């Protein structure tokens, strides 16, 4: 289906075929300095997102569920109506307010479990 | 069941943002020389693949006016052209007195250009020799404020210094594909009746845009794309009578242009190892440059445009009229094709008007008859403000002809008075952003935001 | 043995000491704009290969065996004669045709595993 | 002899034309292979090849 | 121009031929310059011929 082929497909149907959209984020071809700027900018963006995923413990990415509990004040919406028949592009316009809060919790939870990875392995 | 946080990567999500799109072109131009043509000197070989993809359930608010791709196209073409004039000769020895002859003809009509002599510095700095060249009158101005009927000047040298266009490069509009770097997508509307701004219920994604023609014209929009199914009228705000209204036709109107005079190439060494060019004697008989348009086709075009100008002005008349006025660059239909800059008078294209009466279009008496526009030719050009604004176009020997397709109009609605019901449109000159806005209307750039967060039924197995 | 020190060695003997050849793919030192172009091109190449490995699930790379079954029509060659006494450089000139086919299967198999990583973890 | 052809430049007095030796070499991800068989015709295989 | 007694802080009024917009036509002109930027031209004695 191509690059954005699942744009507008259901969130269930769009949550697969993620690799074809992950595989396009890195490429390059230049004339002049002002496009070399764009190239290194894109490389930087990719590395920033990868580093963010790693800080959450989702290295080897693509889909990665976690422990930071879903506070009801983030969605207040029904699971079927959000998964079966909503689309990701218009899901963003329902949760864009609250992702930036969740990211910090999602880092500190990784810290809180890597502490156990330290301690329990030491004791064993 | 409970719900925790989960993160997906590779999600389809968009936000429109600025980005520098890089130009690409078809591979046949990339065996060519430096600066010939700009479409290859500063671009990359394009690929038709991946083919166009349609997004099967979408809605995105395209906007033809609140757009930033035209700004990039403007900046890129200015910088590219200013780069293209660097290796050329800069004509500073030509800022000298020109003594001109006063040949004259009376009765009927005549189209003379002056024969002017001027002392030149040869390869030797301190030795000079008498010479001559023929110049069109618009580029020749009298020098002295005191009365003298023979001592003239080039129109420059009062303003900035001024440059010859390189003889090896061309002004031919090779098509250009603008397209996006990684992490950005170009979204394309596909609803044929699109007003220009507002939602498109059918939206698509492409890798690289359709080949745009960097072609210059003021009052008529020359070689380019054609509308899909009917004429479309597009303006930023039709309640405003000053803004440029773009009319994009369905069927083209063919126009042929010609300079019949069999001109000659004359060369002049000006300083050590660089040559100034000029026209020598005119061979044959002196004649008038012009352009022809079929009359019935123009009546049909202006009538079909009148049918849609009355969708916003139903009761009133539409009453086309001559350009308002101003300098030679402001009023005429200026264009370049064949290499010589034409400036054609358009007053006969907008002399009458569709009066609501949609007069019968068939059967035409003689479709081979045409309406001729008389034209004037320059050699010194002020293309845009400030970008090394001179270009002396070296003359092309022989007689030349040019054939091209009309595809759109730039018009303007005149100021009303006395509550007039018969109000009038006119041809419009405009900045070049207006010209290219008719071509980049279909496209918008979006960034890909591939990281999303969702509630899910699984917990990390710590 | 150095950079290509195992070139020509047996495929078994060259399948080890991969780190010394993996470590040389990143470096840079530049004069002018064209060598800067070369530098960012190398960085992009490394990231492309890393992303491809991650899409297959071989993150934390070096050696990573999988499930995508070896169709007999890819080699039709005996295991000892290919592992004990062939070398990688002339192994490519026996299998160069069919790698580009295998890569897509090797992506979708990782997808088919991530689906279970979702489902079975959810049910537990 | 010039001034009929292009204009023409003095060599700067501070710089020199001395041929200082130059080492060409490749960026990361590329290698230089060196033939080391002394009788090499110039084209064709080298049975001894080095990096 | 000269002043005597007390003190004076004056600057010179120097004329110079200039090429106009036409390469091969010239016109007379003048400008005032502070002395530190004006030096006598000829090594031979001349009370009026100066240089930048
Ligand atoms: C533009 O003006 C120039 C001069 O200002 C014209 O060039 C001049 O043309 C005349 C006529 O051919 C030349 O004089 C003739 O020379 C022959 C020598 O074979 C002689 O037998 C004749 O008695 C006559 O003297 C003259 O040399 C030439 N001037 C220069 C500088 O070359 C030119 O024809 C004019 N062009 C137009 C289109 O009006
Ligand atoms: C220069 O003028 C001649 C004569 O007007 C042109 O020759 C004609 O060109 C047309 C095509 O434009 C042909 O259909 C005719 O057969 C040609 N001959 C005649 C006698 O008409 C010539 O094309 C012009 N030069 C250029 C470059 O257009």
Author numbering:
A (entry chain B), C (entry chain L): 520 to 547, 569 to 664
B (entry chain A): 32 to 139, 150 to 185, 185a, 185b, 186 to 309, 312 to 321, 321c, 322 to 354, ...
D (entry chain K): 194 to 244
E (entry chain F): 134 to 139, 150 to 185, 185a, 185b, 186 to 193
Paper text:
In DH270.4, a VH S85R mutation is positioned for interaction with the N156-glycan.
A glycosylated region near the base of the third variable loop (V3) of HIV-1 Env forms a supersite of vulnerability that is targeted by antibodies originating from diverse germline genes in multiple HIV-1 infected individuals.
